[PDB]
Every structure is written in structure tokens, then in C-alpha cells.
């Protein structure tokens, strides 16, 4: 088969964000938006990226 | 006259709205929940503080 380009590393569940979350929070208290919608989503979504392999030895033979 | 308890005669137990929103803001940033839900809602919901609404269960007590 012919060669084709690809990304040097796998995708992760981690993403960049910062200043939207401080900007919404200050106004959401004065406007009385629902925090529960985020906190219940967040309570499930305590996410992390997939780990590396264990790389332990194995064989289809008795001890 | 006779001794009695001073004003205010009873405490209320309502917590700060800020302490949900401050934990939520820090944790939702690291979890990458949607800030766009709060920001799009806030742009319509340009509200301020108000008393509670009426309901069918409300009535004047006999005493």
C-alpha cells in the first residue's frame, strides 16, 4: 500500500478553556441562571484521557 | 417589664449563591462542560432580583 500522512500522537478528552468561565460566572449570579444544569452534568462528567498499555508478559502455556 | 428574647428572634439557614457558582466555575473549566449554555441564556435573561411567584397552594392562615 502507498504512504499517507497522520498525526504523531493520539487524541485526548482534555481541551483548552479559561476566561469564558469567569466571565459567565460573575453575571450568572446577578441574572440568576441555573447552576444545577452545569453541576449535574459535571457530577457525571469527571472525565480523563485513556491510559497507556500495561506491557506485561503473556504466553498460552501452563506454569 | 418582664425578660424576653431580643430581635431578630430567629435565624434563617439560606446559603450563599456564590459558593455553588465558584466551585462550578473552577471544576466545569477543567471538565470542559458547556459555558455557551449560560452565555446564550444570559443574553436573553438580562434579569435582576425579584420576590417569589404566587402558587395555588397559598392561603391566609386562620391565626
From Swiss-Prot, chains A, B:
User: Taxonomically, which superkingdom?
Assistant: Bacteria
Q: Where in this chain does the record put each Sin domain?
A: 8-46
Single GO MF annotation: protein dimerization activity
Which PROSITE patterns does the record match to this protein?
Answer: SIN
Look up the record and give one Gene Ontology term from the biological process aspect: regulation of DNA-templated transcription
Instruction: List the Pfam families hit by this protein, alphabetically.
Output: SinI
Which InterPro entries does this one have?
SinR/SinI_dimer_dom, SinR/SinI_dimer_dom_sf
Entry function: Acts as an antagonist to SinR. SinI prevents SinR from binding to its target sequence on the gene for AprE.
Query: Which NCBIfam families does its entry note?
Result: AntRepSinIBacil
Q: Describe the subunit structure.
A: Heterodimer with SinR.
What name does UniProt use for this protein? Protein SinI
Q: Which organism is it from?
A: Bacillus subtilis (strain 168)
Designated gene of the protein? sinI
Amino acid at each position: 500500500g502507498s504512504h499517507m500522512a497522520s498525526m504523531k500522537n493520539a487524541k485526548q478528552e482534555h481541551f483548552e478553556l479559561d476566561q469564558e468561565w469567569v466571565e459567565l460566572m460573575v453575571e450568572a449570579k446577578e441574572a440568576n441562571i441555573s447552576p444545577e444544569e452545569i453541576r449535574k452534568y459535571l457530577l457525571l462528567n469527571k472525565k480523563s484521557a485513556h491510559p497507556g498499555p500495561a506491557a506485561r508478559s503473556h504466553t498460552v502455556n501452563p506454569f
